[PDB]
């Protein structure tokens, strides 16, 4: 919410810990596992009746939108 870049935040963390720390802020690698709940593909859910033409796997994260294009040359690329 303060639009701080990851590398700028790590800079802030190192500077606030090296001087008088007594470290307050958490390191990056504990943030990277902290949001695994906020992103999609974490909670269990289920429809009824089962959806049409949609798979039932409930853990699909970021999927590439091309959706299985047969990149082979001769078709529309």
């Amino acid at each position: 919410n303060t639009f701080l870049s990851c590398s700028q935040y790590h800079k802030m963390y190192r500077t606030v810990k090296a001087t008088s720390g007594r470290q307050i802020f958490q390191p990056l690698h504990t943030l990277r596992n902290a949001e695994k709940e906020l992103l999609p593909g974490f909670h269990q859910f289920e429809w009824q009746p089962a959806l049409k033409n949609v798979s039932t796997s409930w853990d699909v994260g970021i999927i590439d939108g091309l959706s299985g294009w047969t990149v082979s040359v001769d078709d529309v690329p």
């Binding site: 033409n53 798979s55 699909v60 959706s67 299985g68 047969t70 082979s72 040359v73 001769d74 529309v76």
Partner: protein, 351 residues
């Protein structure tokens, strides 16, 4: 065998990677365009004239009693030649709607009247198919056969989307080869029969098919199961008798390993295979000649016209046949800002 660089002065955004060139009654008609029809041309079909290097596209208008067509991207064109009763017919089936779908309907295109002043009116009719209809597909091939003495059509090959039950919103734009059965279609009525091929255990696509005197010869076509481009040639023989359309088949040992070739007619039955893709990276540069007689295919490589560095180093290329030993090819272009003409055009001529 010389190539002339053309300028697509105006209307160079209507051509797209896959499209068709119908050669009927002299002048050629471009068919297929980017997006749906715009009000400049409410039909979708342009007339092409090449003069002094200029490529000029003119708007064509349909007749009063004809239905209209979506701009099918990669359809299967079959040239039904002049005879009783309505020359000159083109059978189109079935292609890809620009709203990305597969159309399973067959269209029949013909010429109606003229001029008054250098104007041609066309007419399109949907042809209802009572079947046993072949599943909607693109890239397949249709060919007309005349046998003792009646007329039929042979439909073979092509790809299609995943079966309707197994298509998942992640495998949506996935595409697999349709099963390998040959469909015999009567022009009228819509009785279409399906027959199995004991020798062909797999289908293909993008294979140039040449039909002469109730014999059909299928050149190589790209297979997506094994990712192989077979050099073998396929011959099939349709013997139309009352009332079972028996079909037989055989393999020829050697043919050109080619996919998406521009098959331009020159002589009576002599064609030139103008080139395409032999591997996923390298494109065919050599021009080949294919004469067709009842003995078999006679194949000789001919001196390919000297290609400028641009068309020799291009990633991909496509085109179509303007007829009379003349063909059109296109190369996508780069630059900044937009050219905006995304395609440079070349006209290759034989003899």
């Amino acid at each position: 065998m010389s190539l002339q660089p053309l300028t697509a002065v105006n209307c160079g955004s209507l051509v797209q990677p896959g499209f068709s060139l119908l050669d009927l009654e002299g002048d050629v008609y471009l068919f297929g365009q980017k997006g749906w029809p715009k009000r400049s041309c409410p039909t979708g079909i342009f007339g092409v004239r090449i003069k002094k290097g200029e490529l000029k596209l003119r708007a064509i208008s349909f007749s009063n009693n004809s239905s209209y067509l979506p701009p099918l991207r990669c359809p299967a064109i079959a040239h039904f030649e002049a005879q009783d009763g309505k020359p000159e017919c083109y059978l189109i089936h079935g292609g890809r709607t620009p709203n990305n779908e597969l159309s399973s309907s067959l269209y029949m295109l013909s010429v109606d009247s003229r001029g008054c002043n250098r104007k041609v009116t066309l007419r399109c009719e949907e042809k209802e198919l009572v079947g046993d209809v072949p599943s909607a597909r693109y890239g397949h091939t249709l060919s007309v056969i005349n046998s003792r003495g009646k007329t039929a059509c042979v439909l073979f090959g092509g790809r299609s989307y995943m079966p309707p039950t197994e298509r998942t919103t992640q495998n949506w734009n996935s595409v697999v080869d349709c099963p390998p059965q040959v469909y015999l279609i009567d022009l009228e009525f819509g009785c279409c029969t399906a027959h199995t091929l004991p020798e062909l255990t797999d289908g293909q696509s993008f294979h140039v098919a040449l039909a002469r005197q109730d014999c059909v010869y299928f050149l190589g076509g790209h297979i997506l199961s094994s990712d192989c481009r077979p050099s073998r040639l396929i011959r099939l023989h349709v013997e139309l008798l009352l009332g079972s359309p028996v079909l037989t088949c055989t393999i020829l040992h050697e043919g050109l390993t080619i996919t998406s070739a521009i098959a331009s007619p020159i002589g009576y039955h002599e064609y030139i295979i103008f080139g395409g893709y032999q591997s996923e990276t390298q494109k065919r540069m050599e021009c080949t000649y294919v004469g067709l007689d009842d003995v078999g295919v006679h194949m000789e490589s001919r001196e390919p016209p000297q290609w400028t560095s641009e068309i020799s180093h291009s990633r991909t290329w496509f085109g179509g046949s303007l007829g009379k030993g003349t063909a059109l090819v296109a190369i996508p272009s780069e630059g900044n800002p937009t050219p905006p003409e995304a395609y440079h055009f070349y006209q290759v001529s034989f003899q």
